[PDB]
Symmetry: C3
Subunit: 244 residues, 3 copies
């Protein structure tokens, strides 16, 4: 099983065999909530459309795609022992928030994902990255994963847009896999979670298959009430397949 | 231990022995929060006054009481294996939310109770029953529990009304048992919780016993401060107001 | 290992010996958040400034300090068996709340601390003490602890004031230890950060400060300028040292 190069919520990698079991076949996979990319990295579609609201994520993904060697080399420079302390961390963090250069931002952003508190990505109310120092003994530099993702990206487009716009991009030869922010047990709202179910109903009507993952709850069985449902044990996870 | 025909919060236990331990005796038992009826169903009062704000519940209970055979036969028809899929569950939910016939609604409510998600009874902001499909393997049809409920109901009146109104029907021959929506750890408010203790203080003074159960917390010991308290094992509390 | 005479939040002290391991040396210890006094009672500074916002607390401590004997004597009389029931608990609670005598208030207040639900100290919106009856088998009367506190109090001043005013009383010869109300898993986030800023200003002036809290994304954010130490205990506890 190939690993994502970012520490990122979801694609904590079980449920892969289960997603790949119910994931239908096609020329193209659309992921409106790509995140770490672990579905992308462990399937073999001939092409990919991959999207996410987080503009730092997509921008880094676009750099890894088009400037592979230059990127890896600059970013390796920051995984040295001299950088594993707070004095350097808060220094690199301040540079990230002050910079207008996407390439330097994207080198920094991988440093912050691996040297920061629980690998979180968060922002205060002014748009600044505000995750504090993570106090790790030995952060891994993910060389192999970086190369694997770049190779695999040669068959992908990355967009920074909302789930509605990227699902509109799908067509007759597409399959859609949605991994929205989890239902409860400004962020992603209930209106939006139900909205995501609607678009799917629209897509299957046109013979585009859609698969959605999420917790198993009263609200999730309500919203996906017209998919074929599949509970997977582990609290429980729910897979909803809209199969023409 | 006679089982209730409905699933209903709790469930499903009511620590009945501990309740019956402290529950005084009289001619008539008043429950302002009847719910599933565990206590009604497992005691021997000469008679009962039974009440709840949920009007779907009370209407059902009057129908089981007055039209037993008619009801059991119409409800049994929804328990056939042909109705055990999503397509049918959502249709029946819609039929129930659109019906204005009490009998038909009472018949569909049993189905929704037994085929819906975790046995919940919930409504959206438009008043529609909104529990989704439970996907159960093989729902039990509570035929014996139905008939026991009906037989026992012969000595019982049912009222859809709030706890202050049902509690005013008690007299010197009654006992009152209170199972309100739980204290914390249009829902039932803190002001209503305290209000219930105070209606209880005024009852016990008119020589009418009241027993209340709840979680054991800072707010419940404060509200029940003038009753004898017994802690049972989160912890349960039973506040007894004895003359 | 000397105990506090009050049951009180964080008076449960599974640290030390971690606080003392990390607490610097000096003539005077300032506590802005003394509470029940554990650090005070288990250290050997030549003098102390001890402060808290709760005025029932500070008034009590002034009384135990300055009227040790009449106090111990009057309090002892409430710790009998006829007082360990609700009819009496609520009677004394109403007395405390109605009273304007500080001496009798201080006497009722220890009764309420030991006979009351979970040793809580809480007021309602009218400012009346509102903890209910705690139903304990037999509450212990903290005689020896009272004298130990009184005797140690001879080297102490007590002020009823906010962390900002107490921390201003520290000088060259002082050390400051802050035990604030816990960060979340009423004291505000804005105050939580203000505290760390005053500490920063103290260390600039060569006055050490040690702070204690839960280990969280926020506490690491606020205390980002201290040397930090993590104590396993069950969520982790953080200690933050601002050393010259
Ligand atoms: C992480 N993905 C979910 C994983 C997992 N189910 C969880 O909740 O932990 C969500 C991805 O959705 C992205 N996202 C959030 N809102 C939107 C949106 N409105 N449109 C597209 N992507 C979004 C987040 O950045 C995130 O990368
Ligand atoms: C189920 N009973 C409580 C069981 C349990 N202690 C729990 O909290 O889950 C509560 C019952 O009280 C009813 N109820 C809620 N509010 C009122 C009210 N204001 N007056 C009368 N009954 C009420 C509910 O329909 C419910 O049937
Ligand atoms: C109990 N103390 C220690 C905290 C402990 N870590 C806990 O959260 O359980 C906090 C003390 O600080 C006091 N306190 C609350 N606010 C302030 C303030 N603004 N200034 C000084 N003391 C305060 C409380 O009365 C309390 O006694």
């Amino acid at each position: 099983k190939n690993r994502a190069f970012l520490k990122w919520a979801g694609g904590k990698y079980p449920l892969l065999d289960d997603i790949k079991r119910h994931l239908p076949k096609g020329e193209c996979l659309v992921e409106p909530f790509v995140g770490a990319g672990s579905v992308f990295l462990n399937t073999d579609f001939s092409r990919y459309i991959l999207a996410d609201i987080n503009s730092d994520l997509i921008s880094l993904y676009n750099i890894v795609k088009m400037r592979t060697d230059e990127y890896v080399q600059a970013a390796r420079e920051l995984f040295v022992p001299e950088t594993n302390c707070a004095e350097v961390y808060y220094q690199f963090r301040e540079e990230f928030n002050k910079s207008q250069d996407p390439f330097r931002r994207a080198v920094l952003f991988l440093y912050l994902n691996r040297y920061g508190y629980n690998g979180l990505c968060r922002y205060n109310l002014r748009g600044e990255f505000n995750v504090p120092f993570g106090r790790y003994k030995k952060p891994y530099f993910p060389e192999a994963e970086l190369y694997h993702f770049a190779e695999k990206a040669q068959n992908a487009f990355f967009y920074c847009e909302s789930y509605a716009d990227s699902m509109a991009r799908a067509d007759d030869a597409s399959v859609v896999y949605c991994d929205p922010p989890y239902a409860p047990l400004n962020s992603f709202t209930l209106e939006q979670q139900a909205h995501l179910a609607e678009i799917a109903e629209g897509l299957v009507e046109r013979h585009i298959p859609v698969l959605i993952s999420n917790h198993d709850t009263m609200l999730t069985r309500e919203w996906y009430q017209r998919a074929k449902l599949h509970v997977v044990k582990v609290v429980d996870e729910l897979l909803a397949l809209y199969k023409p």
